Amino acid sequence: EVQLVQSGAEVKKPGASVKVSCKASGYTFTSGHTFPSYDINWVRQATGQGLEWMGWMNPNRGNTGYAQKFQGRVTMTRNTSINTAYMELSSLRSEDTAVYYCARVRSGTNYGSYYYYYYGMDVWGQGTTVTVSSASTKGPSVFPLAPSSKSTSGGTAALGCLVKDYFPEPVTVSWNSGALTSGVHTFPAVLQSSGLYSLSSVVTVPSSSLGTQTYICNVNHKPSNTKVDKRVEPK
Protein backbone atom coordinates (compact mmCIF):
# COMPACT_ATOMS: atom_id res chain seq x y z
CA GLU A 1 0.00 0.00 0.00
CA VAL A 2 2.60 2.57 1.02
CA GLN A 3 4.63 3.42 -2.07
CA LEU A 4 7.41 5.78 -3.12
CA VAL A 5 7.37 6.54 -6.86
CA GLN A 6 10.40 8.22 -8.38
CA SER A 7 10.91 10.19 -11.59
CA GLY A 8 12.49 8.65 -14.69
CA ALA A 9 16.06 7.93 -15.68
CA GLU A 10 18.40 10.89 -16.14
CA VAL A 11 21.45 11.50 -18.33
CA LYS A 12 23.77 14.45 -17.66
CA LYS A 13 27.17 15.81 -18.65
CA PRO A 14 29.98 16.37 -16.14
CA GLY A 15 29.38 19.65 -14.36
CA ALA A 16 25.61 19.55 -14.77
CA SER A 17 23.00 19.05 -12.07
CA VAL A 18 20.05 16.67 -11.71
CA LYS A 19 16.80 16.90 -9.76
CA VAL A 20 15.10 13.64 -8.82
CA SER A 21 11.56 13.46 -7.46
CA CYS A 22 9.88 11.00 -5.11
CA LYS A 23 6.08 10.93 -4.81
CA ALA A 24 4.64 9.30 -1.68
CA SER A 25 1.32 7.46 -1.46
CA GLY A 26 -0.56 5.19 0.93
CA TYR A 27 0.12 7.39 3.96
CA THR A 28 -0.17 11.05 4.90
CA PHE A 29 3.02 12.75 3.73
CA THR A 30 3.05 15.23 6.65
CA SER A 31 1.97 14.69 10.23
CA GLY A 32 -0.33 17.61 10.97
CA HIS A 33 0.00 16.73 14.67
CA THR A 34 -2.15 13.62 14.04
CA PHE A 35 -0.54 11.16 11.62
CA PRO A 36 2.67 9.16 12.16
CA SER A 37 5.64 11.25 11.09
CA TYR A 38 7.91 9.98 8.33
CA ASP A 39 11.05 11.44 6.81
CA ILE A 40 12.36 10.92 3.27
CA ASN A 41 16.01 9.83 3.04
CA TRP A 42 18.04 9.35 -0.14
CA VAL A 43 20.51 6.53 -0.79
CA ARG A 44 22.47 5.89 -3.96
CA GLN A 45 24.23 2.81 -5.31
CA ALA A 46 26.65 2.51 -8.21
CA THR A 47 26.28 -0.70 -10.24
CA GLY A 48 27.87 -3.61 -8.41
CA GLN A 49 28.61 -1.42 -5.37
CA GLY A 50 27.16 -0.88 -1.91
CA LEU A 51 24.69 1.59 -0.46
CA GLU A 52 25.76 5.20 0.12
CA TRP A 53 23.77 7.59 2.28
CA MET A 54 23.14 11.09 0.96
CA GLY A 55 20.86 12.80 3.45
CA TRP A 56 17.52 13.02 5.24
CA MET A 57 14.60 15.40 4.90
CA ASN A 58 11.70 15.86 7.31
CA PRO A 59 8.80 17.00 5.07
CA ASN A 60 6.91 18.57 7.99
CA ARG A 61 9.16 21.65 8.37
CA GLY A 62 11.57 20.79 5.54
CA ASN A 63 14.65 20.65 7.74
CA THR A 64 17.44 18.47 6.42
CA GLY A 65 20.74 16.86 7.19
CA TYR A 66 23.20 15.94 4.44
CA ALA A 67 26.06 13.47 4.50
CA GLN A 68 29.47 15.19 4.77
CA LYS A 69 30.44 13.82 1.34
CA PHE A 70 27.68 15.81 -0.46
CA GLN A 71 27.42 18.91 1.74
CA GLY A 72 27.48 21.98 -0.47
CA ARG A 73 26.23 20.32 -3.66
CA VAL A 74 22.97 18.66 -2.55
CA THR A 75 19.55 20.08 -1.75
CA MET A 76 16.55 18.16 -0.48
CA THR A 77 13.16 19.88 -0.75
CA ARG A 78 9.49 18.91 -0.93
CA ASN A 79 6.16 20.19 -2.24
CA THR A 80 3.75 18.97 0.46
CA SER A 81 0.67 19.85 -1.57
CA ILE A 82 1.55 17.05 -4.05
CA ASN A 83 3.23 14.58 -1.66
CA THR A 84 6.56 14.84 -3.52
CA ALA A 85 10.11 15.11 -2.19
CA TYR A 86 13.05 16.19 -4.32
CA MET A 87 16.79 15.62 -4.36
CA GLU A 88 19.03 17.91 -6.41
CA LEU A 89 22.68 16.99 -6.91
CA SER A 90 24.94 19.56 -8.60
CA SER A 91 28.52 19.56 -9.94
CA LEU A 92 27.93 16.11 -11.37
CA ARG A 93 31.07 14.02 -11.82
CA SER A 94 31.18 10.61 -13.48
CA GLU A 95 31.54 9.02 -10.03
CA ASP A 96 27.94 10.16 -9.42
CA THR A 97 26.70 7.61 -11.99
CA ALA A 98 24.48 5.43 -9.81
CA VAL A 99 20.92 4.43 -8.97
CA TYR A 100 19.38 7.02 -6.65
CA TYR A 101 16.80 5.77 -4.15
CA CYS A 102 14.44 7.67 -1.93
CA ALA A 103 13.42 5.83 1.23
CA ARG A 104 10.99 6.40 4.09
CA VAL A 105 11.92 6.23 7.78
CA ARG A 106 9.94 7.24 10.87
CA SER A 107 11.00 10.81 11.70
CA GLY A 108 13.82 11.05 14.19
CA THR A 109 13.96 12.60 17.65
CA ASN A 110 15.54 16.01 18.17
CA TYR A 111 18.16 16.29 20.90
CA GLY A 112 18.79 20.02 20.56
CA SER A 113 20.62 20.36 17.25
CA TYR A 114 21.16 16.58 17.03
CA TYR A 115 18.89 14.22 15.09
CA TYR A 116 18.49 10.57 16.13
CA TYR A 117 16.92 7.83 14.00
CA TYR A 118 15.64 4.65 15.62
CA TYR A 119 13.84 2.94 12.69
CA GLY A 120 14.83 1.35 9.42
CA MET A 121 14.22 2.54 5.89
CA ASP A 122 10.92 0.71 5.62
CA VAL A 123 9.76 1.66 2.09
CA TRP A 124 12.07 2.35 -0.88
CA GLY A 125 11.33 3.97 -4.22
CA GLN A 126 12.01 1.97 -7.37
CA GLY A 127 15.15 4.06 -7.97
CA THR A 128 16.20 6.43 -10.71
CA THR A 129 19.36 5.86 -12.70
CA VAL A 130 21.54 8.95 -13.18
CA THR A 131 24.18 8.63 -15.89
CA VAL A 132 27.01 11.14 -15.83
CA SER A 133 29.25 10.94 -18.88
CA SER A 134 30.77 13.18 -21.52
CA ALA A 135 29.01 11.05 -24.14
CA SER A 136 26.01 12.31 -26.06
CA THR A 137 22.75 10.42 -26.59
CA LYS A 138 22.92 8.04 -29.56
CA GLY A 139 20.59 5.37 -30.87
CA PRO A 140 21.87 1.85 -31.53
CA SER A 141 22.83 0.08 -34.69
CA VAL A 142 21.00 -3.26 -34.75
CA PHE A 143 22.70 -6.11 -36.42
CA PRO A 144 21.21 -9.58 -36.99
CA LEU A 145 22.85 -12.57 -35.32
CA ALA A 146 21.82 -15.05 -38.00
CA PRO A 147 21.40 -18.74 -37.13
CA SER A 148 23.43 -21.14 -39.21
CA SER A 149 24.12 -24.82 -38.71
CA LYS A 150 26.77 -23.57 -36.23
CA SER A 151 24.10 -21.82 -34.12
CA THR A 152 21.87 -24.95 -34.19
CA SER A 153 21.79 -27.85 -31.73
CA GLY A 154 19.25 -30.62 -32.16
CA GLY A 155 16.00 -29.26 -33.49
CA THR A 156 16.58 -25.83 -31.90
CA ALA A 157 18.30 -22.77 -33.40
CA ALA A 158 19.62 -19.67 -31.63
CA LEU A 159 19.07 -16.36 -33.36
CA GLY A 160 19.29 -12.87 -32.07
CA CYS A 161 19.97 -9.19 -32.47
CA LEU A 162 23.13 -7.32 -31.59
CA VAL A 163 22.22 -3.87 -30.28
CA LYS A 164 25.43 -1.89 -30.72
CA ASP A 165 26.81 1.53 -29.78
CA TYR A 166 23.95 3.30 -27.98
CA PHE A 167 23.89 5.80 -25.15
CA PRO A 168 22.64 5.98 -22.62
CA GLU A 169 20.81 3.08 -21.03
CA PRO A 170 18.33 1.52 -21.42
CA VAL A 171 17.09 -0.37 -24.44
CA THR A 172 14.27 -2.90 -24.42
CA VAL A 173 14.07 -5.78 -26.89
CA SER A 174 10.93 -7.73 -27.78
CA TRP A 175 10.40 -10.39 -30.43
CA ASN A 176 7.50 -10.45 -32.90
CA SER A 177 5.99 -7.46 -31.09
CA GLY A 178 5.72 -9.31 -27.76
CA ALA A 179 4.08 -12.44 -29.23
CA LEU A 180 7.29 -14.45 -28.68
CA THR A 181 8.43 -14.77 -25.05
CA SER A 182 9.51 -18.41 -24.58
CA GLY A 183 13.22 -18.99 -25.11
CA VAL A 184 13.91 -15.23 -25.29
CA HIS A 185 16.87 -13.95 -23.32
CA THR A 186 17.98 -10.33 -23.35
CA PHE A 187 21.43 -10.02 -21.79
CA PRO A 188 22.79 -7.17 -19.66
CA ALA A 189 24.63 -4.41 -21.49
CA VAL A 190 28.37 -3.89 -21.68
CA LEU A 191 29.93 -0.42 -21.52
CA GLN A 192 32.74 -0.05 -24.03
CA SER A 193 35.72 2.26 -23.58
CA SER A 194 34.02 4.53 -26.12
CA GLY A 195 31.40 5.31 -23.50
CA LEU A 196 28.75 3.53 -25.60
CA TYR A 197 26.69 0.51 -24.54
CA SER A 198 25.91 -2.74 -26.35
CA LEU A 199 23.74 -5.76 -25.56
CA SER A 200 22.23 -8.81 -27.21
CA SER A 201 18.84 -10.46 -27.26
CA VAL A 202 18.72 -14.08 -28.41
CA VAL A 203 15.91 -16.55 -29.08
CA THR A 204 16.06 -20.32 -29.17
CA VAL A 205 13.43 -21.56 -31.65
CA PRO A 206 12.72 -24.91 -33.31
CA SER A 207 15.02 -25.27 -36.31
CA SER A 208 12.04 -26.48 -38.36
CA SER A 209 10.26 -23.10 -38.13
CA LEU A 210 13.21 -21.26 -39.74
CA GLY A 211 11.56 -21.68 -43.13
CA THR A 212 7.97 -21.19 -41.96
CA GLN A 213 8.00 -18.47 -39.26
CA THR A 214 9.36 -14.93 -39.36
CA TYR A 215 11.42 -13.55 -36.46
CA ILE A 216 11.64 -9.80 -35.83
CA CYS A 217 13.43 -8.19 -32.91
CA ASN A 218 11.88 -4.88 -31.81
CA VAL A 219 14.53 -2.66 -30.24
CA ASN A 220 13.36 0.44 -28.38
CA HIS A 221 15.80 3.10 -27.19
CA LYS A 222 13.55 5.76 -25.66
CA PRO A 223 16.42 8.10 -24.60
CA SER A 224 17.08 8.75 -28.31
CA ASN A 225 13.43 8.22 -29.36
CA THR A 226 14.54 5.43 -31.69
CA LYS A 227 12.73 2.20 -32.53
CA VAL A 228 14.35 -0.43 -34.78
CA ASP A 229 12.66 -3.52 -36.20
CA LYS A 230 15.05 -6.10 -37.65
CA ARG A 231 14.10 -9.41 -39.22
CA VAL A 232 16.64 -12.13 -38.41
CA GLU A 233 16.94 -14.81 -41.13
CA PRO A 234 19.11 -17.94 -41.49
CA LYS A 235 21.92 -17.24 -44.02
Binding site: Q68, F143, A146, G160, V190
Partner: protein, 214 residues
Protein backbone atom coordinates in the same frame (compact mmCIF):
# COMPACT_ATOMS: atom_id res chain seq x y z
CA UNK B 1 33.89 3.09 1.86
CA UNK B 2 31.52 1.39 4.28
CA UNK B 3 31.52 2.18 7.96
CA UNK B 4 30.04 -1.17 9.07
CA UNK B 5 31.96 -4.44 8.59
CA UNK B 6 30.24 -7.49 7.16
CA UNK B 7 31.71 -10.41 5.20
CA UNK B 8 31.57 -9.88 1.43
CA UNK B 9 30.10 -13.34 0.85
CA UNK B 10 28.32 -16.24 2.54
CA UNK B 11 26.99 -19.51 1.24
CA UNK B 12 24.82 -22.43 2.24
CA UNK B 13 22.85 -25.41 1.00
CA UNK B 14 19.00 -25.35 1.21
CA UNK B 15 17.74 -25.98 4.73
CA UNK B 16 20.91 -24.70 6.38
CA UNK B 17 21.05 -21.76 8.77
CA UNK B 18 23.23 -18.92 7.47
CA UNK B 19 24.33 -16.16 9.84
CA UNK B 20 25.81 -12.82 8.75
CA UNK B 21 27.80 -10.71 11.16
CA UNK B 22 27.75 -6.92 11.17
CA UNK B 23 30.35 -5.14 13.28
CA UNK B 24 30.25 -1.45 14.14
CA UNK B 25 31.41 0.80 16.95
CA UNK B 26 29.98 2.44 20.06
CA UNK B 27 28.65 5.45 18.17
CA UNK B 28 26.43 3.37 15.87
CA UNK B 29 25.44 -0.19 16.79
CA UNK B 30 26.66 0.34 20.36
CA UNK B 31 24.20 3.14 21.12
CA UNK B 32 21.64 2.74 18.28
CA UNK B 33 20.21 -0.24 16.34
CA UNK B 34 21.10 -2.68 13.59
CA UNK B 35 18.72 -2.89 10.65
CA UNK B 36 19.08 -5.26 7.70
CA UNK B 37 18.11 -4.89 4.06
CA UNK B 38 17.77 -7.59 1.42
CA UNK B 39 18.44 -6.65 -2.18
CA UNK B 40 17.25 -9.23 -4.69
CA UNK B 41 19.00 -9.18 -8.10
CA UNK B 42 17.84 -6.23 -10.16
CA UNK B 43 15.68 -4.97 -7.29
CA UNK B 44 15.58 -2.09 -4.86
CA UNK B 45 16.57 -2.92 -1.27
CA UNK B 46 13.80 -3.92 1.11
CA UNK B 47 13.62 -3.70 4.90
CA UNK B 48 14.17 -7.21 6.28
CA UNK B 49 14.99 -6.70 9.98
CA UNK B 50 14.76 -3.47 11.97
CA UNK B 51 15.66 -2.47 15.52
CA UNK B 52 17.98 -5.50 15.97
CA UNK B 53 15.33 -8.24 15.83
CA UNK B 54 11.94 -6.95 14.56
CA UNK B 55 10.43 -8.38 11.38
CA UNK B 56 8.38 -6.09 9.14
CA UNK B 57 4.98 -7.41 8.21
CA UNK B 58 5.37 -10.02 5.48
CA UNK B 59 8.91 -11.14 6.37
CA UNK B 60 8.89 -14.85 7.37
CA UNK B 61 10.15 -15.78 10.83
CA UNK B 62 12.98 -17.88 9.37
CA UNK B 63 14.73 -14.48 9.19
CA UNK B 64 15.90 -13.29 12.60
CA UNK B 65 18.26 -10.71 14.02
CA UNK B 66 20.20 -10.01 17.16
CA UNK B 67 22.55 -7.40 18.55
CA UNK B 68 25.26 -7.68 21.20
CA UNK B 69 27.56 -4.80 22.13
CA UNK B 70 28.89 -3.10 19.00
CA UNK B 71 27.93 -5.96 16.65
CA UNK B 72 24.83 -7.62 15.26
CA UNK B 73 23.86 -10.80 13.48
CA UNK B 74 21.37 -11.76 10.77
CA UNK B 75 20.25 -15.41 10.82
CA UNK B 76 18.59 -16.98 7.76
CA UNK B 77 17.03 -20.22 8.98
CA UNK B 78 15.95 -22.80 6.46
CA UNK B 79 17.91 -21.28 3.61
CA UNK B 80 15.98 -21.18 0.32
CA UNK B 81 17.22 -20.63 -3.23
CA UNK B 82 15.32 -17.33 -3.40
CA UNK B 83 17.39 -16.19 -0.39
CA UNK B 84 20.25 -15.72 -2.89
CA UNK B 85 20.70 -11.96 -2.60
CA UNK B 86 22.78 -9.13 -1.18
CA UNK B 87 22.17 -8.30 2.50
CA UNK B 88 23.09 -4.92 3.95
CA UNK B 89 23.30 -4.00 7.58
CA UNK B 90 22.79 -0.39 8.65
CA UNK B 91 22.89 1.81 11.74
CA UNK B 92 22.52 5.48 12.72
CA UNK B 93 25.85 6.90 13.88
CA UNK B 94 25.66 9.92 16.20
CA UNK B 95 29.22 11.16 15.85
CA UNK B 96 29.16 14.90 15.10
CA UNK B 97 25.98 15.66 13.06
CA UNK B 98 24.68 12.10 12.73
CA UNK B 99 24.67 9.89 9.61
CA UNK B 100 23.49 6.48 8.42
CA UNK B 101 26.29 3.93 8.24
CA UNK B 102 26.07 0.77 6.13
CA UNK B 103 27.85 -2.50 5.83
CA UNK B 104 29.56 -3.17 2.52
CA UNK B 105 27.00 -5.91 1.84
CA UNK B 106 27.09 -9.72 1.93
CA UNK B 107 26.28 -11.71 -1.19
CA UNK B 108 24.57 -14.93 -0.08
CA UNK B 109 24.91 -17.82 -2.56
CA UNK B 110 22.51 -20.74 -2.17
CA UNK B 111 24.11 -23.89 -3.61
CA UNK B 112 21.11 -25.99 -4.08
CA UNK B 113 21.06 -27.24 -7.58
CA UNK B 114 22.76 -29.84 -9.75
CA UNK B 115 25.82 -28.90 -11.75
CA UNK B 116 25.23 -27.91 -15.37
CA UNK B 117 27.85 -27.27 -18.04
CA UNK B 118 27.32 -24.08 -20.08
CA UNK B 119 25.72 -23.94 -23.50
CA UNK B 120 27.96 -21.76 -25.65
CA UNK B 121 26.81 -19.94 -28.78
CA UNK B 122 29.34 -17.93 -30.80
CA UNK B 123 28.16 -15.54 -33.59
CA UNK B 124 30.61 -14.14 -36.16
CA UNK B 125 30.38 -10.53 -37.32
CA UNK B 126 27.38 -10.11 -39.61
CA UNK B 127 27.86 -8.89 -43.17
CA UNK B 128 25.90 -5.76 -42.20
CA UNK B 129 28.34 -4.87 -39.43
CA UNK B 130 31.32 -5.59 -41.67
CA UNK B 131 29.84 -3.17 -44.23
CA UNK B 132 29.65 -0.61 -41.41
CA UNK B 133 33.44 -1.13 -41.01
CA UNK B 134 33.06 -2.80 -37.61
CA UNK B 135 33.30 -6.36 -36.31
CA UNK B 136 31.96 -7.91 -33.11
CA UNK B 137 32.10 -11.54 -32.02
CA UNK B 138 29.20 -12.40 -29.72
CA UNK B 139 29.53 -15.34 -27.32
CA UNK B 140 26.30 -16.22 -25.52
CA UNK B 141 26.64 -18.56 -22.53
CA UNK B 142 23.57 -20.03 -20.87
CA UNK B 143 22.25 -22.83 -18.66
CA UNK B 144 25.26 -23.27 -16.37
CA UNK B 145 25.41 -23.93 -12.63
CA UNK B 146 27.02 -22.77 -10.39
CA UNK B 147 27.19 -19.18 -11.64
CA UNK B 148 30.94 -18.75 -12.08
CA UNK B 149 32.58 -18.85 -15.52
CA UNK B 150 35.69 -17.37 -17.09
CA UNK B 151 35.84 -16.49 -20.79
CA UNK B 152 39.02 -16.64 -22.89
CA UNK B 153 39.23 -15.46 -26.51
CA UNK B 154 41.56 -16.87 -29.16
CA UNK B 155 42.61 -15.50 -32.55
CA UNK B 156 43.54 -18.76 -34.29
CA UNK B 157 45.34 -20.08 -31.20
CA UNK B 158 46.62 -16.84 -29.69
CA UNK B 159 44.90 -15.26 -26.69
CA UNK B 160 43.16 -11.95 -27.28
CA UNK B 161 42.64 -9.58 -24.34
CA UNK B 162 42.04 -6.28 -26.17
CA UNK B 163 38.50 -5.19 -26.95
CA UNK B 164 36.89 -7.85 -24.73
CA UNK B 165 33.77 -7.05 -22.73
CA UNK B 166 31.98 -9.73 -20.74
CA UNK B 167 28.91 -9.38 -18.52
CA UNK B 168 28.49 -10.67 -14.98
CA UNK B 169 26.47 -13.93 -14.79
CA UNK B 170 22.83 -13.71 -13.72
CA UNK B 171 20.20 -16.29 -12.91
CA UNK B 172 17.51 -17.10 -15.49
CA UNK B 173 13.95 -18.31 -14.98
CA UNK B 174 15.18 -21.90 -15.38
CA UNK B 175 17.29 -21.26 -12.21
CA UNK B 176 20.50 -21.60 -14.24
CA UNK B 177 22.91 -18.78 -15.08
CA UNK B 178 23.73 -16.90 -18.27
CA UNK B 179 26.44 -14.49 -19.39
CA UNK B 180 27.74 -12.91 -22.59
CA UNK B 181 31.09 -11.83 -24.00
CA UNK B 182 32.12 -9.53 -26.84
CA UNK B 183 35.26 -9.41 -28.97
CA UNK B 184 35.60 -6.15 -30.91
CA UNK B 185 37.82 -6.32 -33.98
CA UNK B 186 38.47 -4.34 -37.09
CA UNK B 187 37.26 -6.02 -40.29
CA UNK B 188 40.90 -6.49 -41.29
CA UNK B 189 41.74 -8.36 -38.06
CA UNK B 190 38.70 -10.58 -38.52
CA UNK B 191 39.73 -11.42 -42.09
CA UNK B 192 43.41 -11.77 -41.19
CA UNK B 193 42.86 -14.96 -39.16
CA UNK B 194 41.68 -18.45 -40.03
CA UNK B 195 39.46 -18.68 -36.96
CA UNK B 196 38.40 -17.18 -33.64
CA UNK B 197 37.25 -19.08 -30.58
CA UNK B 198 35.26 -18.34 -27.45
CA UNK B 199 36.45 -20.66 -24.69
CA UNK B 200 34.26 -20.90 -21.61
CA UNK B 201 35.70 -22.53 -18.50
CA UNK B 202 33.26 -23.73 -15.83
CA UNK B 203 34.25 -25.87 -12.81
CA UNK B 204 37.51 -26.96 -14.43
CA UNK B 205 36.01 -27.94 -17.81
CA UNK B 206 36.28 -25.84 -20.97
CA UNK B 207 33.61 -25.56 -23.67
CA UNK B 208 34.85 -24.00 -26.91
CA UNK B 209 33.12 -22.55 -29.96
CA UNK B 210 34.93 -21.42 -33.09
CA UNK B 211 34.00 -19.24 -36.08
CA UNK B 212 35.82 -18.54 -39.32
CA UNK B 213 35.58 -15.69 -41.86
CA UNK B 214 34.90 -18.26 -44.59
Amino acid sequence: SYELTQPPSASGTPGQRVTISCSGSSSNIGNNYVHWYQQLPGSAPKLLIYRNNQRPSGVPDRFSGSKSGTSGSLAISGLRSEDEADYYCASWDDSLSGHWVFGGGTKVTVLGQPKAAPSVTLFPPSSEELQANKATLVCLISDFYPGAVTVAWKADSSPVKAGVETTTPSKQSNNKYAASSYLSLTPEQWKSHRSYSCQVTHEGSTVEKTVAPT
